[PDB]
Ligand binder design. Sequence first.
Ligand SMILES: [Ca+2]
Ligand SMILES: [Ca+2]
Ligand SMILES: [Ca+2]
Ligand SMILES: [Ca+2]
Ligand SMILES: [Ca+2]
Ligand SMILES: [Ca+2]
Length: 320
Amino acid sequence: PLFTEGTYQAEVMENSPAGTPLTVLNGPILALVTYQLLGTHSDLFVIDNSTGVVTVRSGIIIDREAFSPPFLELLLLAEDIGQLNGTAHLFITILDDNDNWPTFSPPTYTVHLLENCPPGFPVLQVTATDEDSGLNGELVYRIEAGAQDRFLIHPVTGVIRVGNATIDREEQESYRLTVVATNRGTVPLSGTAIVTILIDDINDSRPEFLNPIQTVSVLESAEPGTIIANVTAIDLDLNPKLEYHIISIVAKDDTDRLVPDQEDAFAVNINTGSVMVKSPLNRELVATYEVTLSVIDNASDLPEHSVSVPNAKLTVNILD
Ligand SMILES: [Ca+2]
Ligand SMILES: [Ca+2]
Ligand SMILES: [Ca+2]
Ligand SMILES: [Ca+2]
Ligand SMILES: [Ca+2]
Ligand SMILES: [Ca+2]
């Protein structure tokens, strides 16, 4: 006997159900008659002992992901009507199905990121996996939601970086992104992951006064100790520690003439910004004060941002 080829190339999609004809690229399988088919992975198939058409067996599940290499070598026999034996070979590529989902494991990320970091700073890398080959196995990364144009992901490498935005903790303290990884090809399977981005703090904000301009009339009969006004500030960083100081006291008499040496006339509480009369008052002596107070967050990592602008103006008018 003589098979029409020495070696027949052949294909089969993984998961093909029982009875599926094997696809023969240089077939049909013919000998010029009985037939059988031998080999180690012969038991995934049955051959017809007359036609020599070959098919998947019953109760057999052909997984490409379980054969590496994903190719099969078998032997074909042909019995002569009186006992001679011709033979040929059968190569069989097992073709790939997209039967494996992009998997994130862990399926969830949480990472910290210091603020004021520059454009294109790399934040982290997500990696999904996929047990298929070619188109079916490859992965387009995408952020489906949560980024707010402050974050971007490399479609190929999964690496997430900052966009063309300043990332200020005091603007927004965290992000929760939803990232997709998708297969290419005719069956676009995807998997999703959560990325949670926590902005760590730099003490980079200015304390600012909430009540900056102030004009208060007080009686000359006010004694040292009397509380007159209260300046108040906030600093939007974590763990600020503010101090209030006075640095101007500009004193004018009844008709606009200045009066030397009155840094003592009032005092502010370093911790509360409560301001009190300190040395005694008299309209006839001084009828107006121009007190200027600043405040300084003492924990500030940037001196440039560590002090109120504007300062607070308290003008005090004395009555009879
Ligand atoms: Ca499979
Ligand atoms: Ca597959
Ligand atoms: Ca896949
Ligand atoms: Ca900031
Ligand atoms: Ca800050
Ligand atoms: Ca600060």
